Amino acid sequence: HHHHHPFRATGDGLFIMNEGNFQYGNATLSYYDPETKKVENEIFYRANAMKLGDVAQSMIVRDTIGWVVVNNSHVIFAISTNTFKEVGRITGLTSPRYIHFISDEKAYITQIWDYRIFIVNPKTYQITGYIECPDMTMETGSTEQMVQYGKYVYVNCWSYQNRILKIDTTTDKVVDQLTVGIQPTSLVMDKNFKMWTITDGGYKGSPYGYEEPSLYRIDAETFKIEKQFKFQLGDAPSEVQLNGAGDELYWINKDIWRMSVDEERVPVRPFLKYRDTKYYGLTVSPKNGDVYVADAIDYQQQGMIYRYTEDGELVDEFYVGIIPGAFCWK
Ligand code: CNC
């Protein structure tokens, strides 16, 4: 007829969630093919004729449907992973963080500025319940990333909290907790069924705290801490990630750092050196073993991704949205 055929996502590509400026409404989604090395920006806007919203935080792909969590627009959009077109949405979310699917019929949505985890039925798009976290307020509340062991979801508590919680999905109740250093940022489960989390500093002039941050290996069966790796005061680490095998752990602390999940010690040498910039998100390809590093670079201008081989040679670098912070494989 007339207009050029719409953009489609063929193949085993990569969504990049760009946070945008908080309060400025300029969050965007990007898509990248590793084979083609072509990035498409603003795919949500261009597909739906509608701005993504305000702090685009995270994403999960589930049977060709992508669940994109817009933290500060109080929403999660279901999109086609082929078309990027909205197929449905979940609204009325305090300030969502991450979504974890127990089943098709039930998922948990963590929140900041709330003491509850929301329970939804993804097939109806409806809230089904709430999970009251102990010793938590609406004023300082924070749930974040999740992993499942058996019948249990574990979840780290970040902004002005110092805990990992343990939830029985049979009852949807918190049944156990573990205190760690302040503001654990992230959580992953390795091939040995050990969780890893890394704290940030707090910040200079926090009313909650400012201490030395730490990486923790934790057994999933027994919920006990096995190691701790303490770093410098004024470090502010973030975004722990695993490779596809779950035997190589990576995190951000000025540089990108890498450690085999086996072995008792933090390597001397990073995976990738500091650049007087703000490395901010991170992922590993489950096909290639390749490492993508999201640079926010000053948090103002258009950000960049940097792609490296498992063995540390630069493959590609490409411009995305403002403050890229998270990835999701298709
Ligand atoms: C830098 C930064 C960022 N932060 Co802070 C983080 N960590 N933050 C910080 C640091 C600021 C040090 C500094 N001034 O450089 C740091 C660690 C101290 C901080 C503090 C906080 N932050 C916090 C959070 C949760 C967030 N932060 C982001 C704004 C989050 C950003 C991510 C994002 N997508 O925006 C972020 C990575 C980039 C913001 C920025 O510097 N923009 C550059 C430039 C454009 O500045 P801007 O327009 O004026 O932005 C200002 C604000 O963002 C302010 N600010 C920073 N964080 C917050 C948080 C809140 C709640 C408010 C009202 C303002 C801020 O600092 C900037 C001053 O110019 C956030 C979007 C990150 C995320 N995606 O989860 C998220 C807020 C989302 C929400 N719904 O609340 C803390 C609650 C974390 C904590 N418990 O320690 C805390 C709040 C303290 C406060 N209100 O003063």
Residue 80 sits in a domain whose CATH number is 2.130.10.10
Decide: helix, strand or coil at residue 172: coil
The finding on whether 252 has its CB within 6 A of some atom of ligand 1 is no
How many CB atoms are located within 10 Å of the residue 42 CB? Answer: 15
Q: How many CA atoms lie within 13 A of 20 on its CB side?
A: 21
User: Domain for residue 8, yes or no?
Assistant: no
How many CB atoms are located within 10 Å of the residue 11 CB? Answer: 10
The finding on whether 323 has its CB within 6 A of some atom of ligand 1 is yes
Q: Resolution, rounded to a tenth of an Å?
A: 2.6
Q: How far is the CA of 329 from the centre of ligand 1 (A)?
A: 27
User: Domain for residue 203, yes or no?
Assistant: yes
CB 249 within 8 A of CB 238: no
- In which domain, by residue range, is 93 found? 14-329
Token pair 């489609």: residue: 8
User: Domain for residue 127, yes or no?
Assistant: yes
User: Domain for residue 2, yes or no?
Assistant: no
Residue 64 is given by DSSP the state T
User: Domain for residue 7, yes or no?
Assistant: no
- Distance from C-alpha of 124 to C-alpha of 42, rounded to nearest angstrom: 28
Q: How many CA atoms lie within 13 A of 174 on its CB side?
A: 21
User: Domain for residue 6, yes or no?
Assistant: no
Number of domains making up the chain:
1
The finding on whether 72 has its CB within 6 A of some atom of ligand 1 is yes
User: Domain for residue 5, yes or no?
Assistant: no
Phi, psi of 44 (to 5 degrees): -70, -50
Copy the structure tokens of residue 322.
């403002």
Question: Sign (positive/negative) of CA torsion 222, 198, 27, 329?
Answer: negative
Copy the structure tokens of residue 183.
């503001």
Name the residue of 18, 22, 114 whose CB sits within 8 Å of the most ligand 1 atoms, as the mutation to test its pocket: 22
The residue contributing the CA closest to ligand 1 atom 6 is: 159
User: Domain for residue 237, yes or no?
Assistant: yes
* Residues comprising the chain, all counted: 330
The finding on whether 160 has its CB within 6 A of some atom of ligand 1 is yes
Segment holding 45, helix H or strand E? helix 43-48
